[PDB]
C-alpha cells in the first residue's frame, strides 16, 4: 500500500480538501468518549494537549457491540477501569501511560476531515523503555513523546508527574533518571 | 437484566426453538476463523474438544474493521501472534492458555441456534491461579476447566502438555503440582 506516516497533527494541513488517505501515527491514549451513537479516541504526542481525535463509526447495534468490545479490550490491555451508556475518560496519561501505534484513514471533504480507526496496536511500556534504551519513524516518535513527557514532569505547574502514575515502576523511575542525563 | 449462566454447551438443549436469550460462560479460547465475511471464535471447557463457537457478525467494511481490531486486541492481550485475509488458528491451548469470561446472545430459530458475541473479558492466568488457590459460577467453571486440563496432561496420548506452553511459568509449574495433591 502507501500508508503515510504522520509525526504531528499539523501535517494534515498539506492534505487534500477531499481525499481518502491511509495514515499512521504514534501517541499516548488520553481520552475516550463512548456514546450509543459514536466513539472518539483522543491521542497526543504532547508536542501539551489533545491532538489526534480518532473516530470509531457505527450505526446499527451489531457494530455498536463491536465498538464496545474494542474499547473494553483496549482499556483492559492498559489496566484501565471501565464501567460496563455514555462513557467518558480524560487525561488518562496523568494516571497511566498508554503508548499506541495507530493506523487510520484520513477522510476529508470541503476542507474538513475525520480520522477513522483502522487498527490500534498498544505498546508495552516495558518495550517502549527498552526500545529507547538499547537504541525508525516509530522510534523517533517514541523518543519525542518521552522527551516532552520529561519536560512536562520538570515543569512544576504541569499536572503530569511520573510518581503519580498508578504504575510507577522501579524500572520507570530508573529509565527517567538515566534519560534526563542525555539532556 | 436476566443473563443466564451456562456451564456447558449441552445446556442449550433446554433453550427455546426460537428465542433471544442473553447467556454467559467461561472457557479457554481454542480457535479463530477470520474471513472477510465472518468471524468465529471457538472456546472449550474441555469437559476434550471445541464446544462453544461464538460469532462476530459484520456486513459492511466499517463493521469488518471493528471485528479486525477486536481480534487484534484479543490476540495481543494473550500474546498470540497475528499476521495482519482469511486467518485461522487452532488448538491455541496447546501453546497458550487463554481463559475468558464471555457474554453472548443465544439466537435460535427452527431449533437452530447461534451464539453472537456481546462481550469478552480475558482473564489473566496469574489471577486464575490465585483465584483458585486462595479459594461462584465463574470459580466453579475455572476449577472444572483446570481439573480437565490436569487430566489431559496426565493422559500420555493427549497432545496437551503444560511444559509445552510457551508461557510455562515457574509459578505455573508450582500451581499444577500443588493442585494434583487435591486429587
Amino acid at each position: 500500500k502507501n500508508r503515510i506516516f504522520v509525526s504531528s497533527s499539523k501535517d494534515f494541513e498539506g492534505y487534500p480538501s477531499k481525499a481518502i488517505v491511509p495514515v499512521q501515527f504514534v501517541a499516548l491514549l488520553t481520552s475516550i468518549h463512548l456514546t450509543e451513537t459514536k466513539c472518539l479516541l483522543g491521542f497526543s504526542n504532547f508536542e501539551q494537549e489533545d491532538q489526534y481525535l480518532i473516530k470509531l463509526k457505527f450505526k446499527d447495534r451489531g457494530s455498536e457491540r463491536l465498538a464496545r468490545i474494542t474499547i473494553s479490550l483496549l482499556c483492559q490491555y492498559f489496566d484501565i477501569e471501565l464501567p460496563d451508556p455514555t462513557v467518558i475518560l480524560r487525561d488518562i496519561h496523568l494516571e497511566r501511560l498508554c503508548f499506541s501505534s495507530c493506523k487510520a484513514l484520513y477522510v476529508s471533504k470541503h476542507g474538513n476531515y475525520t480520522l477513522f480507526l483502522e487498527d490500534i496496536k498498544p505498546l508495552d511500556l516495558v518495550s517502549v523503555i527498552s526500545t529507547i534504551s538499547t537504541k525508525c519513524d516509530l522510534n523517533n516518535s517514541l523518543v519525542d513523546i518521552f522527551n516532552n513527557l520529561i519536560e512536562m514532569n520538570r515543569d512544576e505547574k504541569n499536572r503530569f508527574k511520573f510518581v503519580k502514575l498508578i504504575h510507577y515502576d522501579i524500572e520507570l523511575k530508573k529509565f527517567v533518571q538515566d534519560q534526563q542525563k542525555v539532556l | 437484566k436476566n443473563r443466564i449462566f451456562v456451564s456447558s454447551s449441552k445446556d442449550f438443549e433446554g433453550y427455546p426453538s426460537k428465542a433471544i436469550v442473553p447467556v454467559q460462560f467461561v472457557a479457554l479460547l481454542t480457535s479463530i476463523h477470520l474471513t472477510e465475511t465472518k468471524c468465529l471464535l471457538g472456546f472449550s471447557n474441555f469437559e476434550q474438544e471445541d464446544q462453544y463457537l461464538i460469532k462476530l457478525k459484520f456486513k459492511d467494511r466499517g463493521s469488518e474493521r471493528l471485528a479486525r481490531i477486536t481480534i487484534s486486541l484479543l490476540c495481543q492481550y494473550f500474546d498470540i501472534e497475528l499476521p495482519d485475509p482469511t486467518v485461522i488458528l487452532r488448538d491455541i491451548h496447546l501453546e497458550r492458555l487463554c481463559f475468558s469470561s464471555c457474554k453472548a446472545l443465544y439466537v435460535s430459530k427452527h431449533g437452530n441456534y447461534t451464539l453472537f458475541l456481546e462481550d469478552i473479558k480475558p482473564l489473566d492466568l496469574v489471577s486464575v491461579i490465585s483465584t483458585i488457590s486462595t479459594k461462584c459460577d465463574l470459580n466453579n467453571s475455572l476449577v472444572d476447566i483446570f481439573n480437565n486440563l490436569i487430566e489431559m496432561n496426565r493422559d500420555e496420548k493427549n497432545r496437551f502438555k503444560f511444559v509445552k506452553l510457551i508461557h510455562y511459568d515457574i509459578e505455573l509449574k508450582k500451581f499444577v503440582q500443588d493442585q494434583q495433591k487435591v486429587l
Partner: peptide, 30 residues
C-alpha cells in the same frame, strides 16, 4: 468472480459512507 463482486460493492459503499459522514459531522472543521 462472486467474491469479487461483493468486495467491489462493500468497498464502494464504504467510500460513500465515510465521505457522507465527514460531510454531515466532521471531527475537524475549518
Amino acid at each position: 468472480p462472486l467474491k469479487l463482486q461483493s468486495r467491489k460493492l462493500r468497498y464502494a459503499n464504504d467510500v460513500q459512507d465515510l465521505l457522507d459522514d465527514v460531510e454531515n459531522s466532521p471531527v475537524v472543521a475549518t
